[PDB]
Design goal:
The structure is a homotetramer.
Chain A: E1 2-7, H1 11-25, E2 30-31, E3 38-43, H2 45-54, E4 63-68, H3 83-90, E5 94-106, E6 110-114, E7 117-122, E8 127-133, E9 136-143, E10 145-149, H4 157-160, E11 165-166, E12 172-178, E13 193-196, E14 201-205, E15 211-215, E16 218-222, E17 227-241, H5 247-255
Parallel strand pairs in A: 1-2, 1-3, 3-4
Antiparallel strand pairs in A: 5-6, 5-17, 7-10, 7-15, 8-9, 8-14, 10-12, 12-13, 14-17, 15-16
Helix pairs in contact in A: 1-3
Bound molecules: 8-bromanyl-9-ethyl-purin-6-amine (4 copies).
One 8-bromanyl-9-ethyl-purin-6-amine binds next to helix 2 of chain B.
Pfam family, one (chains A, B, C, D): NAD_kinase_C
Organism (chains A, B, C, D): Listeria monocytogenes serovar 1/2a (strain ATCC BAA-679 / EGD-e)
Keywords (chains A, B, C, D): ATP-binding, Cytoplasm, Kinase, NAD, NADP, Nucleotide-binding, Transferase
Chain lengths: ~260, ~260, ~260, ~260
């Protein structure tokens, strides 16, 4: 199996990476960061996110593993003390898959893939968009912005906005509001909305057409936008799992007590 | 086809029912409230809920239709002026199905079926339960109570508690909190939780073992409770649909503007 | 000075009480639980609440002190290890005062005093009341109920309902909602409301006239209610303070870290 | 009396302004936009905000009046059809005063006055600040940002963030959170905080020292910030009131029904 390892870049992670590389040398494993089948991230969830986006053109060929050298992460859910055991079993595991979010931006097309979420805010002044669900005008949103989250992304920005946590086996996306204006004149639903596969949520500008669009860590300013279109991606991220670490236990460990 | 019609019992609904019965007489339709295949509710969503629970032993044999003589309802989504057209097509439609919630209460077993939600509060004093997810202890909840909602139930009590609205094609259940106590000593997740099929959420008492349990409109006091167990039911409610009235449009009509 | 001491009634608190009584005997202090000028509560905030309500007819004559034998309390904010130092200075301190909430219930009048909050829920079925502010009809509330909190009460039930914490030097009361129904037909403000002195908030029934009314720990069923009237009381609770323990530090210690 | 009139600049407002100027000419009133004692705003609340900030150096010399040519505003609470009656009584009224918020920014000092609120967000990346209350370290906030609101400002951005509405007779300020991160590692209070006069809330950077600071409509990027300090201002805005239009009625008219 070809493999590669990204590191957070501090002393802890680089030395752990060099030790795992040395451990992999004692087996029949070839280090290749061009066409790896196994991508190991050492650091935190942000390190894992960058690893995912480095190889998002070969998602169907890769199994990801995360090692957290800091606190417990939702994607980096292996302890550094287990790195040797990881090297052992990695050289011959079952795969689990999580859904992803497709974002399409049109001008007068660019598509992005998100593992956590995709957000939209205004660049110049007030944020006003018409929210269209499966070609049906649903609401005119006025506020700070909107956030569309994957299932595994619900524990991240989605959670801080009041969204629900949903198990990653559910093929869905969740839309949450950012500081909406609600009075007798302006009306939004308020509640988070959970959409299934094949449902298309479209954002269409009213006045201003420039928007700051974020996809996970990446945040780009887009000008002369005609439409922002969300849907559950056809592609999935594949993890290499070696033990039972249930999602709800990861949620407990991160937010209740560990 | 055998059929029956329940009415809210006011003048508006009873007269509409008698007119539909007369209209059905002009076809080959036999009124039977014992083994109907078509159950028509005339009134509101509460009238529809009672109709559902009257015949929950024959859910697989029945297609439900709701007529709202008051405001627009989420289950009663036909206007009274369309009753004649309803009678026409009902005598020879496709069926749509929504998931349901199974509640199991154990003592020292009773099972219930919910179309909207099932809630738990304390009878004598403070409400404290341990929340167990797939045999994993998740949290110790202290507050007013908890609510487990079906997908179509998310627009009802679940919404008032801050839960997400989710499309009824998703086979899931959603747990929301009622006024939880959170300090350095007591910790709950806070966020709504969305569970897929085959996940089991179990509530287990800590001190008091008497609970007020509600299932849709029905609210019963239970004594010496050992466990409350939630899961997505294997059974579904079947609707008779004659036109496209999308769920998200029903949501818009009920909460944004109609 | 006359004094008295209430105890939570467990072994820890009773033995601490007997030791303080013995310590007070070594000074010129007379134990009197009929007309005390100093009321010492040993236990938790609930023990302090009962002490407050035991002597609410002589609030202007008494200075209260709380000792927490369990976790840090907002009213019982002395450690048991400081009981000897407390006895010393108590025998000759400055006084601080917190505002209180007056509740008036009318039938076809009973007045109550609250240190934390006063809540209203329905007894038989759905809760619907008209909210009147200084004789101006403000809203028709439909939901689980309402909560009116004192400033020091904002850290208690008010906090679990999403209310703001406000410093107890502000003579005000705060009204929060319990699971309100909001659609195109039914509309509430949603936000917590903070009222100054001399503002009167009145709740008036629409259909059902029986309500479960709570005042701190005390919860009574009232029948044939015509009006529930809230206002900031003219009376205040007086504390004996011996050191600087700021409210915001108590908030930090209870909810952030201690 | 000297007076001046600002206009939203559309056809409706300019023509109303010219008519009021003509009406004022029929009395002994001198138009002076340098040292006016009466400042009339015609348009919306944003027009009123600009009028307030045009003359914030002479707040003690001026009485403000707002006319809303669009929907009902919280500061512009006179209808255009009443402009003639306004001119009449304005030429010889009692004054009401609302508290204001003082913001002080320090580098390696600039002070601002807010009628609605003052917000802080990050410019480059993640927002992390230490919140200090009266020199006591209260929390380390991580999220999108923070908002400190005046009493009359509570109906504006503060409301969209979940803050409480408080009557403008209360001399206070309210701090609300923007999408805070809360887990076992990072902890914020969550609830809105209401501070009285003479309480000082200080924000102190942890890593990044560049912040986007907004004061009402005005939003400025500040670099190398050492401290952001909030307190209730000693100065107040004075309104000219001619009739009883209670704050809670304005709240009802804007959010419940008008
Ligand atoms: C700590 C930063 N972080 C990232 Br990056 N992704 C996530 C996630 N999915 N859940 C929680 N936290 C996350
Ligand atoms: C109006 C009462 N009501 C009932 Br009953 N069920 C529902 C529901 N599913 N969504 C919204 N509202 C409901
Ligand atoms: C722990 C129970 N409790 C009582 Br009783 N009063 C309060 C209060 N004011 N703030 C927080 N918690 C309280
Ligand atoms: C409509 C814009 N707006 C402005 Br500007 N100030 C306020 C305010 N205080 N309350 C509500 N809304 C406001």
């Amino acid at each position: 199996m070809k493999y590669m390892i990204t590191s957070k870049g501090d002393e802890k992670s680089d030395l752990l990476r060099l030790n795992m590389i040395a451990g992999f040398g004692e087996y029949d494993m070839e280090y290749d960061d061009v066409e790896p089948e196994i991508v190991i991230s050492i650091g935190g969830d942000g390190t894992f996110l960058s690893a995912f986006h480095q190889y998002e053109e070969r998602l169907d060929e890769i199994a990801f593993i995360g090692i957290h050298t800091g606190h417990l992460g939702f994607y980096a859910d292996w302890r550094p003390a287990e790195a040797d055991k990881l090297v052992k079993l990695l050289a011959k595991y079952q795969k689990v898959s999580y859904p992803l979010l497709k974002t399409t931006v049109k001008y007068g097309e660019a598509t992005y893939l998100a593992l956590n979420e995709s957000t939209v805010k205004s660049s110049g002044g007030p944020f006003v968009v018409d929210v269209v669900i499966n070609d049906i005008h649903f609401e005119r949103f006025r506020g700070d912005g909107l956030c569309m989250s994957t299932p595994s992304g619900t524990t991240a920005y989605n959670k801080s906005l009041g969204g629900a946590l949903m198990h990653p086996s559910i093929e869905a996306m969740q839309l949450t509001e950012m500081a909406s204006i609600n009075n007798r004149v302006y009306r939004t639903i308020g509640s988070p909305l959970v959409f299934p596969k094949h449902h298309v949520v479209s954002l269409q500008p009213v006045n201003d057409k420039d928007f700051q669009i974020s996809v996970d860590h990446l945040s780009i300013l887009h000008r002369d936008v005609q439409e922002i279109r969300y849907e559950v991606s056809a592609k999935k991220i594949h993890f290499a799992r070696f033990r039972s670490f249930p999602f709800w236990r990861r949620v407990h460990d991160s937010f209740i007590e560990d």
